[PDB]
Amino acid sequence: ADSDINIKTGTTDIGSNTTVKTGDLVTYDKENGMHKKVFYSFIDDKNHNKKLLVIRTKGTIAGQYRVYSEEGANKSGLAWPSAFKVQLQLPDNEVAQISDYYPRNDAEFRHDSGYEVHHQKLVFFAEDVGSNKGAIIGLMVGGVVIAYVQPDFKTILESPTDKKVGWKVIFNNMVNQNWGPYDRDSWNPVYGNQLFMKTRNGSMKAADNFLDPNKASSLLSSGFSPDFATVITMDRKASKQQTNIDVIYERVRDDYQLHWTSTNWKGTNTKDKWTDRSSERYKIDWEKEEMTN
Amino acid sequence: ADSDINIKTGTTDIGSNTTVKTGDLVTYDKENGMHKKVFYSFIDDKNHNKKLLVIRTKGTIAGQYRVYSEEGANKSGLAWPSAFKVQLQLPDNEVAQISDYYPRNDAEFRHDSGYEVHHQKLVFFAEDVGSNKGAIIGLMVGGVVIAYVQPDFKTILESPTDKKVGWKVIFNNMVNQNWGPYDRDSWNPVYGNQLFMKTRNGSMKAADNFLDPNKASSLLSSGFSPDFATVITMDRKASKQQTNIDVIYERVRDDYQLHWTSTNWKGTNTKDKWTDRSSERYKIDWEKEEMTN
Amino acid sequence: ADSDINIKTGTTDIGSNTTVKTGDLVTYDKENGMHKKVFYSFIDDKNHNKKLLVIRTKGTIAGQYRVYSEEGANKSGLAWPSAFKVQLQLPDNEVAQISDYYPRNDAEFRHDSGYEVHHQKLVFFAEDVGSNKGAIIGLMVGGVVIAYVQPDFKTILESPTDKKVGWKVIFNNMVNQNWGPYDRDSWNPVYGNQLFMKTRNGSMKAADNFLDPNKASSLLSSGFSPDFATVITMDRKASKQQTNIDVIYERVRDDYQLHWTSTNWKGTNTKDKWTDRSSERYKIDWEKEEMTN
Amino acid sequence: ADSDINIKTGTTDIGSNTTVKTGDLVTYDKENGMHKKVFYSFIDDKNHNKKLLVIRTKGTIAGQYRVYSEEGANKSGLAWPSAFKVQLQLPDNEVAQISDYYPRNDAEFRHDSGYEVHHQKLVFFAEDVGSNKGAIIGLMVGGVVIAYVQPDFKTILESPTDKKVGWKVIFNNMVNQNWGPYDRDSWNPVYGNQLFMKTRNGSMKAADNFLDPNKASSLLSSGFSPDFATVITMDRKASKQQTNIDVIYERVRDDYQLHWTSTNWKGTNTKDKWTDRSSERYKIDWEKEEMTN
Amino acid sequence: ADSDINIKTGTTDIGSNTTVKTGDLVTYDKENGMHKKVFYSFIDDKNHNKKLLVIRTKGTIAGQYRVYSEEGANKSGLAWPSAFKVQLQLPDNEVAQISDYYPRNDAEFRHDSGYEVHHQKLVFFAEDVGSNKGAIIGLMVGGVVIAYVQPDFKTILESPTDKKVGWKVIFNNMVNQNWGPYDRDSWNPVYGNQLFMKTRNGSMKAADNFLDPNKASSLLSSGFSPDFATVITMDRKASKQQTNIDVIYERVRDDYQLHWTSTNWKGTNTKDKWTDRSSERYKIDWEKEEMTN
Amino acid sequence: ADSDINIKTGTTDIGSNTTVKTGDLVTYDKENGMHKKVFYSFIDDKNHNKKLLVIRTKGTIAGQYRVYSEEGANKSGLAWPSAFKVQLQLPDNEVAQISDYYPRNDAEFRHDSGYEVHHQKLVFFAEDVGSNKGAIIGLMVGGVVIAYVQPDFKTILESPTDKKVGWKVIFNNMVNQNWGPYDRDSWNPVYGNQLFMKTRNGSMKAADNFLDPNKASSLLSSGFSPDFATVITMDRKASKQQTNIDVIYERVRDDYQLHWTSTNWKGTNTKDKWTDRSSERYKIDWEKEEMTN
């Protein structure tokens, strides 16, 4: 931090003794089921060399975890979201730049606990008839245990540029009732993909053998609510003080097909079957310090 | 946070150097057993592009965990709440929008600790008669342990829109005396659903074999007290500066039927048997900055 | 929090730039052994739509854990508190309302750590006479461990209304010397209820076989000191600016009867044997902003 | 801290009651896939003996984890980043100096838990025919267990000078699906380097047997976003108040070659195969307190 | 703290409502590879009885972990830093004094967990031919486990005076790849000192059998960056308001000699083989409140 | 805290809106190897009924862990500090009083984890020749494990008065290389006291068989740096506004004698062999608010 270099905290930061122009822009795409909000803040710090626009994408991208097709009591299909995405893209001809962003790709870790342990035991068994017999045992304990947090969904900052930035929320692993973790690539020759199978030998029709969304992560059913900040920077001397920025929300829906083998249930997962995109273009006026749609 | 993008903290936030108009609106629905409160705050930040209304739904939704019917000493019935809900809905013809909300669906996790560990042991047993015999053992430890917090009730943000928003509190799992977790879908062929059975082979009448509410989560008996914030936003230039917002509280009550098999007790759970809704319409005056019922 | 919706912290709160009228009201009920205190704060925020009164019930409700009757060396009786209670009730004809309260029924949890772990071992024993014999062992580790905090006494918010609110402190479990947890419903056919038995085969008279209060939770002997806030709200336009509020403290005392079987000691627990209530009526003057008894 | 020497906190720090001149400088090297940002802050504290420039290198160095060459279904090649680097270098003829920097090389640790534990057991087996036989066992537990955090990537401060400073982010260890940690130097005679092998006996072509970047650390695919502060200091009396500073970003890409042995897959790792450098020269004007490219 | 004695926090501290004169003094000793910085702060608190100078030694002492000599493929030599040191010394004839310093020798601890645990088991084996045989086992668990943090390098405050003060960073223990901790005094009759041996039976020349510095602590290769504060105090009435203070940095380099036994590798460690000292004399002017070199 | 009694924090504290007169008094006793510092703060709070003097004893008491005498290769002697002490004593004829002090004797604890756990196992072994034989095992786990922090040195507040106060730092336990804890009273009939023995069967002369101070706690070699606050209080109306206070530092040095038995090494510990005291008398002027020596 700025204190670790012997500088008073908050001294190098921006926004001190300046007027900030905030605003909200909301809109609901019913077809794609997206509540999109943009919280924009214009900062003209006279001591800063550029005008700043802080664009916080927010809202909720409904997961729409839902059974979409039934071909009878033996087959069914589930649309489940495997990924969300948010992208802000400036046209290549613009003078503005994507100076900063948050969150970023924090360096994670795995707690690694190694073992170098020695045990010794001395047993000397005997009988009432006068027979003694014994052993001395030396036991070595070694190896490693790796422990870390395994979240259901990861958040990732896609490779950004001076014109494009983007976050993606990705499905990493899911824990079923008690059968253990499962991912999109899991494959059991017997049951196929057990990701969303309520039971393996169920007597109900396929449409009813899917996990109840309440048990599963709420990101799948209710959706995911991003809070992603981006910092645009413009030069005051630029002749063109108006820009157009494309804000894009995406929901990638995979197809979980459940089939009856006449013996047990089998599950297959088709990736990126559907992609639901909602793109809006926002006009940014740097002189009046406003944003509109 | 706004510090991670080199911006002074609190600079982009709203409510700086402005007068906020607060208020409380309380009412008790005796029939549905709901204490409803709305804490409203009007914010007209001249630097913000819209008028903000922060509506915090609060109060208490009595669980009403109670025995409702007795058909003798062999059968009884318990009304127990499986879910609470709070919904704020604007009519489709309104100009206002549901800009923001809290709490949201935070991404949860499960601590995943994997094992790759090696043990070696060397035993060499002997007898006093001159007989030696031994073994060398190599032992592998592998697999994973998953540990996470399992709360009795989850809080969830239902898929919102620009006109409707809603939270639901859901029953996830309950721990009986020491018999382990149980859910609404638990089913033992012997005892059926052991969710609220005080004893399996009790000699008392069914009505007395139900768990004492004090032992169980207080959400079931005393109730649940929400604190849910929503942020409405209106354009200052809109001709109609009056709106009507419907605040809805719901208690979903399931029926736990306890039966005597002449050998032991059996429990069944009928979901969403009853639904108790309390809806109020609040008139919002954005010019006088007030809310009324 | 209000920061999570992009609003400066403390902006929507009450009490900014206003004069608050505080006061203390104390009284000791010797008969019921209750030190009752009420800390009242009148808040007239001109920007708020109602007058607020924050009533913090405090003090100490002596547990009075005590031997009350002795019928000889074989029988004795202990009065021990199983529950405390605090209730604030407004008469039904009043215009005021119980807007808010604290503490509430926080959603608790139980840390659930599940296991899916595999072990493999390979033993190959041998003798010096030339005889080898071995085994290969595959071991499965599964199940769950549930770990949570188990306090001696719970605090609960009884189902409130717009006129009545109430907290109850309840005895949940107690740990004896080292014999494990015990509750009011514990029953051993041999010893009955071992909740407060110092010893099972004691040679002393019954009155001396009870747990020393110092070993036990201080809530039983010295008592419990509540800190419970309630928020009354009144409309400024109401013609009647005087109200009467009933503050009630209760101590529920159960009877632990200890008997000699001529072989060992047995304990029985009669619930809610006695109920000690101390009720006071406080006159609230909203114009002079004071409270009196 | 400055409080531990009886000095009021923040008293010895810089930036109190002074005007700070901030700025952003952004640029995207498409060829090397680097988003470079420099956040500069000029501090002229009249009570300080020198002018300070705080240069925070930021941005994102795309990992570019990607299959680069395929020679058929038996061989493939992956370019994966093993290291990132950021260097600020002043020409030797300059009067300015690199006074400070952050982050630095914090002293790490390993939790060392040693054991000195004794167990004793006494077994006395018997048969119904009247034969008793027993043993007394003394068991010693000793040794040590070492547990520490093992991150995927380390951050390091290269040996700095008064003209050059530099950070390097280094690949330390990676955890595959569940096969354990692997590093650049790992070598199995059977499989070679299993760092990025999706499967050992896969039937797919080599290009498809590489780990999905989503599973792997996002530093490899999306990239790494530095936040590295440096503090330049200049004497006010220096005649030459203009300097040129070279900011350098580097991505070191190693080649992971995957080969088919007709039995299983083998992996080899060629270190530092490619080095992608993006260097910019920034003109620093200490009189106008600005930086340009 | 000052609050624990009923005194408002920060009241007894220095630097309140006074002007502080700061400064940086930087210099790079190429020969010894030291980046030396001194951050000085002059404090003349009119309410304090003396003038204070806070001297924070900072910078980086390059470890210079490096192979220095090769006599062929069987022998090699590594210069590795075992200790860093920083010393501030005033000449004995000066009137100034070393009033305070930081960091100091904090009292450490070792978590000591003792055991007094009892287990009992009852086995009763039987055969289908009608033969029963059993045992009752009582098992005692006792002893202690000691767990504490074992850092690679310790920081120590050498015995100070009113004229000399000094910190030393010392090599305590290092963890090799997975062979366990090693120190300067470790000695295996087979391998000697295994501190920096990459492999025990390597086929490469000695110079290539040394640990890669990236694997090892960065203090060895990149170096150590001190932050050590000292507080000089002078009497205002002293006639001589100029002083000379000697700031000394030291790097102690040990020689790790690796030899080939024609069977395996052996390592020896010669302590304090080289000592690299960089001493500077700083002129302190207490009247103009400055420091120079 | 003062908030828990409904009082604004810091309201009852001292030092609000008053001028505080600070000062440092330093001196080095070479013979006893003590760097003594006194940080004094005079507080005359007009709202307080007395004048306060906060005296913080600080500095460093060199441990002087050192070999003092050698009688050959078979015997040696080590002077090691077992205790430090700081005492402030007012003459009995003074009007001033020792009102307060810090640190004090905080109530410590030991984490006590008790066990009441049941295991059951069912084994049923069989042979291929048609012979089955089995057992059912019930296992009880009980007892307690006590875990707490065991520091090398304790800090203690000696029984104070209105004229004398004193802290003592005491040697509690030390951990050797890996042989376990040892104290001053430890005694092995074979090796005597193994507190500072580098090896048990060493071939080096006794003087070289002592633990290296770097391995041991730095309190022994470099020393201990106290920070002990005392609060003197004087009545303003007292005629004699001058006092004399004796500040005393002590180092208690024990003698660790190491002897050669011609078989192994033996260690003996003579307690409180030497006591090194450094006493200074400070003149306190309450009118001019100063302290001198």
Coordinates of C-alpha atoms in Angstrom, one line a residue, chain D residues 22-147:
Chain D
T22 CA -1.8 12.3 -10.9
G23 CA -2.1 10.8 -14.4
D24 CA -2.8 7.6 -16.4
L25 CA -0.9 6.4 -19.4
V26 CA -2.3 3.5 -21.3
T27 CA -1.3 1.6 -24.4
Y28 CA -2.0 -1.9 -25.9
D29 CA 0.7 -3.9 -27.6
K30 CA -1.3 -6.2 -29.8
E31 CA 1.7 -8.3 -31.0
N32 CA 2.8 -9.1 -27.5
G33 CA -0.7 -9.0 -26.1
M34 CA 0.0 -6.6 -23.3
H35 CA -2.3 -3.9 -21.9
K36 CA 0.2 -1.5 -20.2
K37 CA -0.9 1.2 -17.8
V38 CA 1.2 3.6 -15.8
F39 CA -0.4 5.5 -12.9
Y40 CA 1.9 8.3 -12.0
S41 CA 1.7 10.7 -9.1
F42 CA 3.9 13.7 -8.6
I43 CA 4.5 14.8 -5.0
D44 CA 6.3 18.0 -4.2
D45 CA 6.2 18.1 -0.4
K46 CA 7.9 21.4 0.6
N47 CA 9.0 19.8 3.8
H48 CA 10.6 16.9 1.9
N49 CA 14.1 17.2 0.6
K50 CA 13.3 15.8 -2.9
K51 CA 10.5 15.6 -5.4
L52 CA 8.8 12.2 -5.5
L53 CA 7.2 10.3 -8.4
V54 CA 5.1 7.3 -7.6
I55 CA 4.9 5.1 -10.7
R56 CA 2.4 2.2 -10.4
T57 CA 2.8 -0.2 -13.3
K58 CA -0.6 -1.9 -13.9
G59 CA -2.5 -3.6 -16.7
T60 CA -2.7 -7.2 -17.9
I61 CA -0.1 -9.4 -19.5
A62 CA -2.1 -12.0 -21.4
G63 CA -0.9 -15.5 -20.7
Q64 CA -1.6 -16.7 -24.2
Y65 CA -1.8 -20.4 -23.1
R66 CA -2.4 -21.8 -26.5
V67 CA -1.7 -24.7 -28.8
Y68 CA 0.7 -23.4 -31.4
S69 CA 1.7 -26.3 -33.6
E70 CA 0.3 -29.7 -34.6
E71 CA 2.2 -32.3 -36.5
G72 CA -0.6 -34.8 -36.6
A73 CA -2.6 -36.8 -34.1
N74 CA 0.5 -38.0 -32.2
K75 CA 2.4 -34.7 -31.5
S76 CA 1.4 -31.3 -30.4
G77 CA 2.9 -28.2 -28.8
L78 CA 1.6 -25.7 -26.2
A79 CA 2.9 -22.2 -25.5
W80 CA 2.4 -21.6 -21.8
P81 CA 3.7 -18.6 -19.8
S82 CA 6.2 -19.6 -17.1
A83 CA 7.0 -16.0 -16.0
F84 CA 5.9 -12.4 -16.2
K85 CA 8.3 -9.5 -15.6
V86 CA 8.1 -5.7 -15.1
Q87 CA 11.2 -3.6 -15.1
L88 CA 11.7 0.2 -14.7
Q89 CA 15.2 1.3 -15.8
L90 CA 16.7 4.8 -15.7
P91 CA 19.6 5.6 -18.0
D92 CA 22.9 5.6 -16.2
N93 CA 23.5 9.3 -17.0
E94 CA 20.3 10.5 -15.1
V95 CA 20.4 12.4 -11.9
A96 CA 17.2 10.7 -10.6
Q97 CA 17.2 7.6 -8.4
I98 CA 14.9 4.7 -7.6
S99 CA 14.3 5.5 -3.9
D100 CA 11.6 3.0 -3.0
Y101 CA 9.4 0.2 -4.3
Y102 CA 6.6 -2.2 -3.4
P103 CA 5.9 -5.1 -3.1
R104 CA 9.0 -6.5 -1.7
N105 CA 10.3 -10.0 -0.7
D106 CA 8.4 -10.7 2.5
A107 CA 9.9 -13.3 4.7
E108 CA 7.7 -16.4 4.4
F109 CA 7.4 -19.3 6.9
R110 CA 6.4 -22.9 7.2
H111 CA 4.3 -24.0 10.2
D112 CA 6.4 -26.7 11.8
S113 CA 4.5 -29.0 14.2
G114 CA 6.7 -31.4 16.0
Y115 CA 5.6 -34.5 18.0
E116 CA 6.7 -36.0 21.3
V117 CA 3.8 -38.2 22.3
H118 CA 3.5 -41.5 24.2
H119 CA 0.9 -44.2 24.0
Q120 CA 0.5 -47.3 26.1
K121 CA -1.9 -50.3 25.6
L122 CA -2.6 -53.4 27.7
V123 CA -4.3 -56.3 25.9
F124 CA -5.2 -59.5 27.7
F125 CA -7.0 -62.0 25.4
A126 CA -8.8 -65.1 26.7
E127 CA -10.7 -68.1 25.4
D128 CA -13.7 -70.0 26.8
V129 CA -11.6 -73.1 27.2
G130 CA -9.5 -71.4 30.0
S131 CA -6.5 -70.0 28.1
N132 CA -5.3 -66.4 28.8
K133 CA -2.5 -64.6 26.9
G134 CA -1.6 -60.9 26.8
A135 CA 0.8 -58.1 25.9
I136 CA 1.8 -54.7 27.0
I137 CA 2.7 -52.2 24.2
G138 CA 4.5 -48.9 24.4
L139 CA 4.2 -46.7 21.3
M140 CA 6.3 -43.6 20.5
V141 CA 5.0 -40.9 18.2
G142 CA 7.7 -38.4 17.0
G143 CA 8.8 -36.4 14.0
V144 CA 7.5 -33.2 12.4
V145 CA 4.7 -32.1 10.0
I146 CA 5.4 -29.0 7.8
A147 CA 2.4 -27.1 6.5

